[PDB]
Symmetry: C3
Subunit: 604 residues, 3 copies
């Protein structure tokens, strides 16, 4: 009774808040301590969990304004008893349907004791049976928690209700969680996902470690799932999962949107980064109206593989994007030391993914994979894929491959070493005839660029649309036209028309060229105007060379070395000065001079 | 007296350092505990604050080499009493003017009890009345502090002195703070800013949350203000403020410089990212000499709006840059679900901002805004704006708009969906005639590119300056000139001069073209040389076609199908072989042959 | 004996785990507490270190499954006694050769008491004598540790064994450490490095501060050394070191590979970011087979200098890359306010570095440095250097300089202010004749671009390889060829061949041009075809203008204004319609008509 008096004095000091041991907890790894937790938690004081293994016969419910802190991971341990049945998460907020506010959890281990159920078992339904489930809550800070041997997830942030709602694409579920911080947490040995979000927003997941699920279904390190939005993940690590970071939805739910990945390291996952929207992948399916806005940077992928046979032996990826609009990837390094682990495609952008950008990519060691980067589109309006500053080190028989359905591709500054690849084919390959391409460099690929079946092995620069260079202003240029090295006032307004080295000169002539000229105009077809001033060619095949103030208006009518004449004859070459003065008549075989025609001349 | 004996033994154990309760603190929410804090703090031991609300009748002064740690946010709470007057911050370093060293603060709530003053009140002047003020200090670590109901700022890092110094642009204030770490802190209900820096350097602000100011002036989540430099912000969140992150100075102070934003999430702020230097915005004002170097990446902006009417109903922005030189933005996602919240410009670069770069941008939902990105310049030398890899999803009647004063613009890989926009106009619009542009893709915009009033709807590629392609080396090329498909030794050295498909061929001829030639030279004006070897055209309108070793030196003198002749006649077509052998004289209407002229011929 | 009874009750409560004071530790700064630490650590309980300076006469050995936590930095202090000899780290895992698992260290100061040895002393050999040495361990979390006055390193993660292994390039040492987290740690006053990794993998180093080594050799803030791989550093700061972050190996070891830097701030280091592989730098040395894959972003460098004379007065750098393949840098800001601190090169890519990319760079104040960015290559196959979106503010007499051995360079969107530079030369300078360049803007540089000795001051756009614009598909284009403004079916298959404004027209003619034509073909040399339909030029210097269904097969044979003729004469101009009808014979000086030749004509 002396020790009990001393303890009473210590308890009253409340150095940490109130200890659970003050309310009767033993933390001996045997005794049911649930009532002690419930009493401390309802007391209104911040609650402290000291050293021990605190056994619990039912889930710990958290009310609003809870502070629960432990002595640390693997120091304060909270654990389900062997006798606990099915249906409850180990720790969760009390108001399951409308939520709670202001919950601060730090520094302990949650052990779900999934072992007690035998092997091969996951959550019984919906969000039930995670180690930590946060439903419809606002202002939740989760820090330095280790979640171990979990039946469903390690840590799950979701909307109100025990079930996950499936309300269809383009919806938002009632009672989201909001303002959540998950930092320095670890999740392992889970049945589904390590750390996951559903139908919630304004979430930061920082410096966490999720690894080694028990099962081999859709078991992801970080799963930003159905209904999520406005989430930042940064400096996390995943290991040995299906997806490292998955961002998705099911077919009957809205995809996660506006998600930022500010650095991540994926170790030996199947698909390190896996962004998708089930049910919105097929050509005959609707486009997702929710799968939009992902910005990911400083992404690391190491030895992706499917040794464990996740998802019925799904093929490995460094990055897989499907369904999503507006994905921006900057700074990606994929590395492997075993060429047989991933043999299909290292990076894929397919299945209705659109308006995606990849910049600053290094892929090394994928020497038995068919494709480094493989993009397939749907001939959708306003689509684009931009791939720039990519370096491939023995990665991909096709380094960058662009398939069907892609009309707008920009591929710039790609370099590749192919010497160590098993049967390399081409650094860059394109199905469409009009990719935009520049800055290719390679060694050990038999072909550098293959564009719609034509090989380019000595450098390539391809640009699309109306073209203009070395010209500070101009009028209209047709998409099959150009103006170069010209001063103001020029136009090339029809298919196959162009102006070079001229001033104030215009062509509306299909199949035409004006060069070295001023104030000249071509307006027929098959027109040529060269080194001329105030020249007009206005009939089919009409042309002028070294002419001033002259108009060629005849069919196949050419004017040479002339000033101030207008000609109209068919198949005639003419010259003159204020009046026509000679003619070579190809039609009738006549030669005519205004003055004399003579032989026996000398030029001195 | 037994309990007091037990307590004495516990106190002597010093398990945390020394508790404030050992020095008399009650932490009961009523009793003035200031003397207990002062005694513990002056004792030389690390100081611990256990569970309680510790009331204080004056500010807590911190000397050098202080360790002050609490039981945690909302566990250890430190609070001004209702009776406290004006002028003091709740917690600050003792040496206000020359500073202190080595201060380590962790795990407690600071409650400024601004309520006690009535509503609508902010700091009485300068840096006075923040929850935490650090002045002229070196080596300060601030961790897991919650700052609540603050009169001025939540956390303020500043130079020595109670007042903020206003020494003019280009200055550095004496006694900066240096080496500061602010991590996992929260600031809310403040009068000015949540977390702010002044006249200080070498600062990391990490994983903090600043939200919901009391007032509606320049009330920012994170304000990197007057005199700041060498600051990193990473993985912070701001919500419901004027600026999410503001980087600035007032007119009579140096702007913050060399600031890095390594990821941020802004939720429902007015201007999520707002970089400016007051007094250095107008065309007739001086350029800031201090506003330089901002690198920002992985920036998230959500539902920017001005529902609260901050700053006299300032218009919302995802990003606003003014005054600053050298701003690099990479990976920006702006998202809204309410088109009426922001109706002017989503991203603006204006008011003397220069040498700015935006890459990897996704803007979605801004379907009633006039401009997606709007850039205005000042025709300043060495200026540039680079915009690349941008995707717009129903954001901006003008997607990317370039206004006046901009001579150097690069706009590449821009795509836009305009179908859901209220009256869309153009994906890209340019006032200047010479933007550099490529890779535009759109649906639902009536015009794709409008360049100085001319529409391009079928693809566009525009480049500036001297142009060269498919040519590995050359001599000089004029800015209104080009060389293409040529081997070494070519030049096109004057306005409107160009060489195609040639070797060792040079033109200094204004309005000229050399093609398909070798060792040829044009040096008059209006010169054409085609399919020739060793040809020279050296007079106005002189030309040669299919000629070898020949020189055309006459006015409008054309040589055809010839070898080894030099001609000088005006308005003459000539041919020959070592000597001139025929002539078509346009001037006088004469035709001359050296040998015979005959009719009645056949060609067999 | 009453106080001892109370203490016994407290000890039994185990509020933190077990305190070292329970096992006899005094923490008085004098008494040897090693046996108390050893007893607590072997007890199986988590171990707590309360307030005190705990002196230790030998290193603290950590077994597997250790939890050791203190009252905090500068609160719980662990220190070597003055009498301790040489050879031991202060704290290390017990199994030096095969390693330990599951070690969790938090919240204390390690004071190595290097002072006790006199000044100028470092580790006696290999990994011996760091404050904290982790050898061959799995699952180690190191948090909130301050490492002070260290003999060797502050914190060292290494493989098994006391010595560092030197097994040669391309090897992997046995018994790596794996899964290591180092967060919020500080290292200072060390003999070698602050925080370093060797022969280990899956490591995150976050929010740490390494500064001010005692010595002036290879003394780095963060050194990712020999054998390291799969490491993320983020939001760390280094100050006053040789390298801020060094990534390297020695000559007889494999370089660190697949390293991510997700933001860093370097303050007054010599080489802020220094990536190298000793022994693999010289032209006559082997290429490193291990130095691959570095992705670094949001890098800050401030006032780099060598005031302390590190490494025999090595010259300062913002960034130095050598030996490494596949380095991607995005978002770099270098800033200085003292132009005399760094006078050679701000950023260097040299000494066998290859396939490197720099994007989004701002360098300001380096106004007495010779080079802003200086790249040297080795004429290696598949090499590339990409430099884009760079802004220089009075930094570098040569802003961007490309030296010898570089065949593939892309330099885009570079702008520079040179007005405040001491004798500026050129914004961009290139030794090679064929750099790819666009988007240059400058003020205050006397030359904008100098390309192999030729100056371009008015804008430049240079592209390499086969060129095509405003043409949606084509057949083959030679690398010294082009097709522009054309529709399908065109080819330009040989050197110096090109097609403009045409349809289904092909040239295999060296030095040729087809323009404004359809179904035409050039297959000789020196061929010109203009404004023609179904025209063939198949002999040297043959040409056709305004011709339909005609073939020019003569030497220097030109056809004009014709239909349906085939000509074969040498030095002849011909025209006709189904048959040849006139000829101008340059060879013999004859003029021939099929019908009449007449003078005295008029054209009305
Ligand atoms: Ca899952
Ligand atoms: Ca403010
Ligand atoms: Ca070293
Ligand atoms: Mg899920
Ligand atoms: Mg301010
Ligand atoms: Mg080393």
């Amino acid at each position: 009774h002396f020790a009990d008096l001393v303890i009473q004095v210590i308890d009253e000091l409340k150095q940490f808040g109130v200890s659970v041991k003050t309310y009767g907890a033993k933390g001996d790894g045997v005794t049911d301590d649930i009532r002690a937790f419930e009493k401390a938690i309802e007391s209104g004081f911040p609650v402290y969990v000291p050293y021990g293994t605190f056994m619990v016969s039912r889930g710990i419910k958290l009310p609003s304004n809870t502070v629960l802190t432990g002595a640390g991971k693997r120091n304060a341990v909270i654990r389900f008893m062997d006798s606990v049945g099915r249906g409850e998460s180990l720790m969760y907020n009390e108001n399951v349907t409308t939520g709670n506010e202001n919950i601060f959890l730090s520094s302990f281990t949650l052990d779900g004791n999934n072992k007690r159920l035998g092997q091969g078992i996951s959550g019984i339904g919906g969000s039930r049976e995670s180690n930590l489930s946060i439903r419809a809550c606002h202002n939740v800070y989760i820090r330095d928690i280790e979640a171990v041997d979990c039946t469903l997830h390690g840590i799950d942030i979701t909307c109100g209700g025990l079930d996950y709602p499936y309300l269809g694409d383009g919806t938002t579920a009632p009672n989201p969680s909001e303002n959540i911080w998950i930092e320095n947490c670890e999740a392992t040995g889970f049945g589904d996902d390590g750390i996951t979000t559903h139908h919630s927003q304004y979430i930061n997941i920082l410096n966490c470690y999720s690894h080694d699920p028990r099962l081999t279904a859709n078991c992801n390190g970080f799963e930003i799932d159905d209904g999520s939005r406005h989430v930042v993940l940064s400096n996390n690590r995943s290991k040995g999962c299906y997806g490292g970071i998955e961002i998705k939805a099911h077919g009957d739910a809205p995809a996660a949107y506006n998600i930022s990945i500010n650095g991540h390291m994926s170790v030996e996952d199947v698909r390190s980064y896996n962004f998708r929207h089930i049910g919105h992948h097929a050509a005959t399916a609707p486009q997702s109206v929710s799968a939009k806005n992902i910005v990911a940077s400083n992404l690391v992928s190491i030895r992706p593989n499917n040794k464990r046979g996740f998802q019925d032996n799904a093929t490995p990826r460094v990055l897989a994007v499907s369904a999503y609009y507006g994905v921006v990837i900057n700074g990606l390094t994929g590395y492997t030391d075993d060429p047989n682990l991933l043999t299909e495609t290292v990076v894929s952008v397919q299945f209705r993914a659109r308006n995606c950008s990849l910049n600053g990519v290094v892929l090394t060691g994928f020497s038995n994979s068919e494709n480094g980067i493989y993009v397939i589109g749907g001939s959708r309006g306003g689509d684009a894929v931009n791939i720039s500053n990519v370096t491939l080190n023995n990665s991909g028989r096709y380094g960058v491959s662009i398939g069907s359905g892609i009309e707008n591709v920009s591929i710039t500054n790609i370099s590749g070493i192919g010497d160590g690849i098993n049967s390399p084919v081409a650094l860059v390959s394109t199905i469409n005839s009009n990719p935009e391409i520049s800055g290719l460099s390679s060694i050990g690929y038999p072909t550098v660029a293959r564009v719609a079946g034509t090989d380019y092995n000595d450098g390539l620069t391809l640009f699309n649309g109306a073209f203009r260079a070395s010209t500070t202003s101009s009028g209209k240029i047709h998409s099959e036209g150009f103006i170069m090295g010209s001063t103001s006032g020029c136009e090339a307004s029809v298919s196959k028309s162009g102006v070079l080295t001229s001033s104030s000169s215009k062509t509306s002539s299909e199949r035409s060229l004006i060069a070295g000229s001023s104030t000249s105009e071509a307006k027929g077809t098959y027109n040529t105007i060269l080194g001329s001033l105030g020249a007009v060619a206005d009939e089919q095949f009409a042309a002028l060379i070294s002419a001033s103030q002259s108009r060629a208006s005849g069919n196949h009518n050419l004017i040479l070395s002339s000033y101030g004449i207008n000609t109209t004859g068919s198949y005639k070459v003419n010259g003159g000065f204020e009046k026509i003065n000679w003619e070579l008549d190809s039609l009738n075989g006549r030669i005519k001079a205004r003055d004399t025609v003579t032989g026996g001349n000398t030029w001195s």
